């Protein structure tokens, strides 16, 4: 998810935030009208810190939203991991069975992504999700297709 992002959209979003506040450098310096550069620099730094923290928490929330779809498939259902480990511990073999089809994980991914609002809210997240989506769908198909025999 993080790797998908790009600089231009992030800069555009930061500029949009500044414009929405109306707190542009020229207006702020014209407002204060003093040469105490350290104070204005600290004010700007704290503004950017607020924006950065909000972005961090937003992205964390979305990322946790994505992870929940895959996690339940690992421990149980097709491709269960403890079954693999006990297969290894008993014989060293691991019989597998395969069919290509779309199942629960792909449906969950499809439902989650098309509804989520952060895609509309942030262009950066929109592009990142659009780029990362296909890989998520391939990985979900990988989860759903394979089964470890009983």
């Amino acid at each position: 998810l993080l790797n998908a992002t790009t600089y231009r959209d992030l800069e555009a979003d930061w500029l949009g935030h500044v414009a929405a506040r109306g707190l542009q450098p020229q207006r702020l310096v014209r407002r204060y009208r003093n040469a105490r550069e350290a104070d204005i620099a600290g004010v700007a730094e704290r503004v950017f810190d607020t924006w950065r923290n909000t972005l961090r928490t937003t992205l964390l929330d979305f990322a946790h939203g994505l992870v929940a779809c895959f996690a339940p498939g690992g421990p149980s259902g097709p491709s269960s991991f403890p079954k693999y480990i006990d297969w290894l511990t008993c014989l060293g073999l691991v019989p597998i069975l395969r069919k290509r089809q779309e199942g629960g994980v792909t449906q969950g991914l499809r439902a989650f992504l098309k509804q989520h609002p952060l895609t509309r809210q942030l262009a950066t997240v929109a592009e990142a999700a659009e780029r990362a989506g296909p890989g998520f769908f391939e990985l979900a198909l990988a989860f759903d297709s394979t089964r470890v025999a009983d």
Binding site: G16, H17, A20, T54, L55, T58, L118, Q121
Partner: peptide, 7 residues
Amino acid sequence: PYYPGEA
């Protein structure tokens, strides 16, 4: 104004 994670 606007913020990146608000409704």
